[PDB]
Amino acid sequence: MQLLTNHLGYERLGAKQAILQAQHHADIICCQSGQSIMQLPLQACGPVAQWHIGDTYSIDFTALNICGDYRIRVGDTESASFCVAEGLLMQNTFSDVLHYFKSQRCSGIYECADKKVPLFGTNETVDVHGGWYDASGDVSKYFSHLSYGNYLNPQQTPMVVWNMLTAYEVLEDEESIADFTRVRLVEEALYGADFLLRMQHPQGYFYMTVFDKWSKSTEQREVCAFSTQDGHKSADYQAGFRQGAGVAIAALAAASRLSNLASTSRIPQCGDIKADTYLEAAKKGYWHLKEMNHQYLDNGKENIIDEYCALLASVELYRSTQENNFLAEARMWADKLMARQMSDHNFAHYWAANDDGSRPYFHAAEAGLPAIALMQYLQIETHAQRAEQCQSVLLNALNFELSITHEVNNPFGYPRQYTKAVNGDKQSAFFMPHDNETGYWWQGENARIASLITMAYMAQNTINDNEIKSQLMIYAHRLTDWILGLNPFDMCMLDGHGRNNPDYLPELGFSNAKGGVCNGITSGFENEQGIAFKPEKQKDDMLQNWRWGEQWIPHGAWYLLAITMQFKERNHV
Amino acid sequence: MQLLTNHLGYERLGAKQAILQAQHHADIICCQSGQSIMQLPLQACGPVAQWHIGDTYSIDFTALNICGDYRIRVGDTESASFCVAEGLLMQNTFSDVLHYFKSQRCSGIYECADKKVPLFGTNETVDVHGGWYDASGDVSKYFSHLSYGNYLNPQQTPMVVWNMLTAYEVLEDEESIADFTRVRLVEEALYGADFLLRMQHPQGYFYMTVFDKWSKSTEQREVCAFSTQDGHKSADYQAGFRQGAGVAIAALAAASRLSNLASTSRIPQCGKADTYLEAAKKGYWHLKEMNHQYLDNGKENIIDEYCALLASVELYRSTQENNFLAEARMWADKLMARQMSDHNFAHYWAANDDGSRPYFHAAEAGLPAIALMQYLQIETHAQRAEQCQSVLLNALNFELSITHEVNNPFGYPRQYTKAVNGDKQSAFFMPHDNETGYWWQGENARIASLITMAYMAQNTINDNEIKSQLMIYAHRLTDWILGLNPFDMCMLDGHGRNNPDYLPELGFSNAKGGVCNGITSGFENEQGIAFKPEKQKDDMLQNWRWGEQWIPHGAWYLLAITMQFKERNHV
Numbered sequence A: 001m002q003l004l005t006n007h008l009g010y011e012r013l014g015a016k017q018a019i020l021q022a023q024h025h026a027d028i029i030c031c032q033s034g035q036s037i038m039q040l041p042l043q044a045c046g047p048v049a050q051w052h053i054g055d056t057y058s059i060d061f062t063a064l065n066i067c068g069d070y071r072i073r074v075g076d077t078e079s080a081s082f083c084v085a086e087g088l089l090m091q092n093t094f095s096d097v098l099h100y101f102k103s104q105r106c107s108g109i110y111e112c113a114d115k116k117v118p119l120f121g122t123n124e125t126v127d128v129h130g131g132w133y134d135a136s137g138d139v140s141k142y143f144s145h146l147s148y149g150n151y152l153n154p155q156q157t158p159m160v161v162w163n164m165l166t167a168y169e170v171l172e173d174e175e176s177i178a179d180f181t182r183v184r185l186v187e188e189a190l191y192g193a194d195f196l197l198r199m200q201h202p203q204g205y206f207y208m209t210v211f212d213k214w215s216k217s218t219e220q221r222e223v224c225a226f227s228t229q230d231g232h233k234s235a236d237y238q239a240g241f242r243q244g245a246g247v248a249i250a251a252l253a254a255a256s257r258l259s260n261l262a263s264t265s266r267i268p269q270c271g272d273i274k275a276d277t278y279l280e281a282a283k284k285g286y287w288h289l290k291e292m293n294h295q296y297l298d299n300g301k302e303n304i305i306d307e308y309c310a311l312l313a314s315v316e317l318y319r320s321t322q323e324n325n326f327l328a329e330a331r332m333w334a335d336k337l338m339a340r341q342m343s344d345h346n347f348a349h350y351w352a353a354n355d356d357g358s359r360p361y362f363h364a365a366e367a368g369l370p371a372i373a374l375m376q377y378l379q380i381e382t383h384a385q386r387a388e389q390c391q392s393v394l395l396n397a398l399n400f401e402l403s404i405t406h407e408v409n410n411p412f413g414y415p416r417q418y419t420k421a422v423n424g425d426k427q428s429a430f431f432m433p434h435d436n437e438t439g440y441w442w443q444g445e446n447a448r449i450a451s452l453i454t455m456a457y458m459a460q461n462t463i464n465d466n467e468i469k470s471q472l473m474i475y476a477h478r479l480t481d482w483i484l485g486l487n488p489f490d491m492c493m494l495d496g497h498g499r500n501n502p503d504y505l506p507e508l509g510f511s512n513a514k515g516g517v518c519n520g521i522t523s524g525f526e527n528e529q530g531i532a533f534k535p536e537k538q539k540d541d542m543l544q545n546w547r548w549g550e551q552w553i554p555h556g557a558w559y560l561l562a563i564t565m566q567f568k569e570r571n572h573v
Numbered sequence B: 001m002q003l004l005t006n007h008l009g010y011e012r013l014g015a016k017q018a019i020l021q022a023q024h025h026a027d028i029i030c031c032q033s034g035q036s037i038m039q040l041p042l043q044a045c046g047p048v049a050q051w052h053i054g055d056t057y058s059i060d061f062t063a064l065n066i067c068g069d070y071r072i073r074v075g076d077t078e079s080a081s082f083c084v085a086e087g088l089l090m091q092n093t094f095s096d097v098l099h100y101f102k103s104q105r106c107s108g109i110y111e112c113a114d115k116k117v118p119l120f121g122t123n124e125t126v127d128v129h130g131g132w133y134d135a136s137g138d139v140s141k142y143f144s145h146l147s148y149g150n151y152l153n154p155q156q157t158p159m160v161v162w163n164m165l166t167a168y169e170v171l172e173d174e175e176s177i178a179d180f181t182r183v184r185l186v187e188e189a190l191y192g193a194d195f196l197l198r199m200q201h202p203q204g205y206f207y208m209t210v211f212d213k214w215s216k217s218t219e220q221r222e223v224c225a226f227s228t229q230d231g232h233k234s235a236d237y238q239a240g241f242r243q244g245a246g247v248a249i250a251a252l253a254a255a256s257r258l259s260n261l262a263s264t265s266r267i268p269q270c271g272k273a274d275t276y277l278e279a280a281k282k283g284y285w286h287l288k289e290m291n292h293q294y295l296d297n298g299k300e301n302i303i304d305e306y307c308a309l310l311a312s313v314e315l316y317r318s319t320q321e322n323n324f325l326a327e328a329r330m331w332a333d334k335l336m337a338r339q340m341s342d343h344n345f346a347h348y349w350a351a352n353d354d355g356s357r358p359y360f361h362a363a364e365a366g367l368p369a370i371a372l373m374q375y376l377q378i379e380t381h382a383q384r385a386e387q388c389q390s391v392l393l394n395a396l397n398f399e400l401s402i403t404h405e406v407n408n409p410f411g412y413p414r415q416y417t418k419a420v421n422g423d424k425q426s427a428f429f430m431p432h433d434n435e436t437g438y439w440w441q442g443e444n445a446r447i448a449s450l451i452t453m454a455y456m457a458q459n460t461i462n463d464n465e466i467k468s469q470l471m472i473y474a475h476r477l478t479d480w481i482l483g484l485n486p487f488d489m490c491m492l493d494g495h496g497r498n499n500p501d502y503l504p505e506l507g508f509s510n511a512k513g514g515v516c517n518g519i520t521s522g523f524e525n526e527q528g529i530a531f532k533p534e535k536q537k538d539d540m541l542q543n544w545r546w547g548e549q550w551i552p553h554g555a556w557y558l559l560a561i562t563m564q565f566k567e568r569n570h571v
C-alpha cells in the first residue's frame, strides 16, 4: 500500500488530505514523539476513469491546526514526513522560483544575437534582447505560439510579467515580506517589462516570437510566427490580443503604477523607473489593436482568449489613468467575456471558446483567466447593477469548475474541464484532448492548475457567498497538493523541493532548473481515459517526451502568483 | 543509533563509507530488491577531539560497484537511500551550480549603480558593472578582502573565473558532456572574465572590491578596501598578487586561450581573446613593478607566490614566451621553499619566511599544491620537474598524514595552525584568534580545494600508494560537504537533507545550487564542533559564520566535481 501526501506539507489553516492506495482508520503521528495525535476514518474513493491506479481512500485531517512535522500511518504503512506551517509555500519556495527566473534570463551569445535579429521575410533586423528563455529545452522567447489553432494561444512572457507585478502589489501590505525580496521581485518584473517594450514595433503592435526552430543556433533566431511541430516559420508576427499582446499591455500599464506603492520610494534607487514610458507603450498598443486586431488573428475572428486578455489590458489601463474612456473599454470587454458563459445538455454555465458554444473553452496554460479577468474588472466597477450581474456570472463560473471537478470519482481533486476534440463531441475530462486544432500539441497542465489555484484564492476577496468560498479553499489546496507530489506518481514537480523531481534531457545538456515547474501529467498516450507521465513507450522518444518533463516558464509564473494569493488568504477564517 | 551517509551517494568506483553513531555488522540493501547484497563489519573509532559525538563505527562498502539505489541497515536502524552511479555528482549537481552562479549575477539597481561607483576618498567614478554578488547576505563584489591580516586573503571572484575555465578545459575531452553545457559553462566564465577586465585600472592594477559596508544600499557602494568587522573603508584598493590579482591575471590569460580548444569553434557564437591576454600581461608586469607597495605589511608570502605562479604559468601557456617560463620557475622556487619541517611536522606549509606562522586557509588550502601541479604541466626541464615532484609528494603526504594523526572517522581534512597569542598546533578547524581579530567560518571552499588537489594529483604524481590514499581522502571530504557529518546536513542547497538557510526572514535566502560556509569548531570550545550553536544562532553578528552562502564554496565545489569526473574511472 502507498500513502500519498503533499511532499512539502499543508498551510496551517488549509484543507488537508492524504490518499491511500490499497487492496478502517489512519493516525497522524507527531514526529517529535512518534505517538498518534488524531485518528481519522478512511473514505473509499473507488476507481478513477481508466487510470487503473487501483482503489483509493482519502484521509481528511483539516482539523490539524498545529504547526510542526507529521506523518500519516495506516497499519504498518507510513507516509513521508511533511510540515504544517503558516505561509508554508511563501516561506519555503517563493525565493527559489525568483532565482529560477533569474537563472533563465536570455544572456551570453543569445542576448548578443537578439540585439540584431532578422525579421522574417525581410532584410531588416531588430533589437529584442532581454526576457527569458521559454523552456528548459528552448532558448526561444515568446509572447505566444499555436496561433494557427486559434483557440489554444497561451500567454507566455507577458503573463510572467503581469503575474509578477500582480504578486508585487498583493505583497505590498505584508509586513513579514522583506524589502530585499521586493527589490528582487520588482527587478524581475521590470526586467520583463523592458523586454515587452523592445518587442513593440513603432506602429504599435508587438512581435509574437523570437524563434530558433528549437535549434539553439544563434543564426537561426528570427522574429516570426510559426506553425506545426516542424516549426514552419511565417511573417504573421503581429501579435493580436489573444496572442500575448493584451496581457503585455496590461503588464505595461500595471508597471507604470509602481510609484503608487510605498515600497517603490523606500527601496534602494538607481535613477528612476521608466513609468511614462511603460504607460505610453501600453496605450499605443491598446489603441492600435482596437483598429487592427482582426487582421492579426489566424481566422480573423476574436474569441474568448482575446476578450479576457483585452479585459485585463483595459482594466489596468483604467487603473493607471483613471480616464473614463478605459472604463468604457473594460465594460465592453467584460460584456463580451460574460456572454461566453453558456449552458447545454451536459453543463450549466461552461465557458464557450466560440460564438455558439459548440466548442468549449479549455486551456492547458491558463483556464483560470476568464474568471480572474472578471475579478480584476470587479475591482474597478463602481456601478451597482453592472457589478451584481458580473458577480452572478463569476459565481456561476466558479460553481462550474467545482461541479465539473466533482462530477466523477476524483480522490485527488484534479481540476476537470469541458473539452472537444476536432472530430469528437463535447465531453467532460481530466486532461486536454490530444486531437485538437494544432494537430500535435498537448502536454502536462501545471500552469492551468496554478491559474485555477490563483482564481480560487482571488475569489475569497471578490465573491460574497461563504459556502462557495469555502469549497474554493478546499479546491485550491488539493490543486496545490497535486503539483507538489500528491498525485499517482508520488512526484513533486517543483524542482528542488519534495521527491522524485523529474528531469528533461540532462544527457543532451537540457537540464531542468531548480525553482522551476515542469509541464507535468497528461492522459495516456494511447488511452485518453488513462493517465501518464513519461510512459514507457514514448519516454525515450524526443518527438514526444517534452510533453512531460520539460519546464516552461508559464508553469513557474502561475505557481508564483498562486502561492502569493494563498499567502494573502492564509488567515482566512 | 544514527547511520550517516553521503546524502547523494557514491561515485561507482570511489571509496565508500558510512558512519554509525551509537553507544553488530551491517547490511547493504538493494532498494529495488528490499533485500541484502553485502554484509560488512563495523570498525570502532574513538571519540573525536572534544566534539562529544559519542562513539562511532565506520563501514567500508567500497567494493560495491553496481549502479543503483541502496540503504545501509544495522540492527533495525536504516540509513536513508542513496545512489551509486558513474559520474554521480556531475550528472546530478553540476548544472545546478551553474544556475546558482547565473542567479547570483550582479543585476538590476546594483548593476546600474556599479556603472558609476566612486573610488574611495575621491569623487572619481568608474564603471565596474558585472560579476556576482559575493554571498547570500552581501551584494558587494570582491577580488579579495581581509588584506589587513596579510595571511588570510581569499581568492574570490577571480577564483570563480579560473575554476570555471579550468573545468571547461578538463571537460573538453569528455564525449558524454553536451555542447549546450559547454555553452553555459564558458558563458559564466567569460561573463566573469569581462568583469575582471572592468576591474583593471588603465595603469594595470585591479580594484580589490566594490563594497557597501553590507548595507544593500546603492549610494554606499564604492571601490575600496576595508578592515575589521565594522568594515572601515580605505583607499588601499590596488590589488597585490595575494589580493585576488594573481588569480585574475591567471584567469584572463586562460580565457585568451579558448580558441585552441576544438569546442570553441564548434558551439554557437556571436560578437575578445587578445583583449584578455593584453590585460593579463599588463596586470602581470605592473605588479612585478608595484606588488610590495600594495601589500599591507609590504612583505610577499606563500599566498602571493601560489597566485603569481598561477598567473605566470597561464601566461606561459597562452604566449609560449620564454620570460614567462622563467617567471614561473622563479615563483615555483619561492613556493617550494615554503615547505618546512619543525618539531611537529615534516613538510608543512609555512606562510612566513622562517615558518613560525604555518599556512592554513579556510577558502583555498589546496592552492599551494594545485599551483605546483599547474607548473608541472609546463616544466620540460627534467631535474627541475623532479625536484618539484618531490616537494609536491611531501605536501600531499603532509595533508594525509595530518588528517590521520588523530581519531578522525569522518576523515575531515586537518591543518597546522597558530593563533596570534598561541603556539603552532594541528587542529580540525581554523583558529578563531587570528590576525583579522574576528573572522572565521565554515570551511567548505577549503574542503573542495583539497578535493580538487587530491584528484589533480592522480594525473601528476607517480606514487600509486599515495594516489590511492588521495582518492579515498577526496571521497571522504566530498561526503562531508554532502551530508556525511555529525549534523546529517547536506550543504549543497537543493540536494540531500537538512539544507541550512541564512536569514530568510530578512529576505536573505540561500540559493539553490550554492554551498554555505558550513561547520566550525565550537564558539566557546575550539576543540568542539558547531553549526548554528544555540547561543549564537540568532545573533546576527555571529551567525553568518555557518549558514551564509559565499561564491568561493560553489566555485571550488564546481571544480572539485569536474576533477572527480575526470578521474572517475581511476581505480
Ligand SMILES: N[C@@H]1[C@@H](O)[C@H](O)[C@@H](CO)O[C@H]1O
Binding pocket: A134, A135, A137, A138, A145, A441, A443, A519, A546, A547, A550, A551, A552
Ligand atoms: N515551442 C515549445 C512549446 O510548444 C512547449 O509547450 C514548451 C514546453 O514543453 O516547449 C517550447 O519549446
Ligand SMILES: N[C@@H]1[C@@H](O)[C@H](O)[C@@H](CO)O[C@H]1O
Binding pocket: B134, B135, B137, B138, B145, B439, B441, B517, B544, B545, B548, B549, B550
Ligand atoms: N564580507 C563577508 C565575508 O567576510 C564572509 O566570509 C562572507 C561569507 O559569510 O560574507 C561576506 O559578506
Ligand code: NA
Binding pocket: A147, A208, A225, A236, A237, A238, A239, A240, A243, A296, A297, A298
Ligand atoms: Na498574428
Ligand code: NA
Binding pocket: B147, B208, B225, B236, B237, B238, B239, B240, B243, B294, B295, B296
Ligand atoms: Na592593496
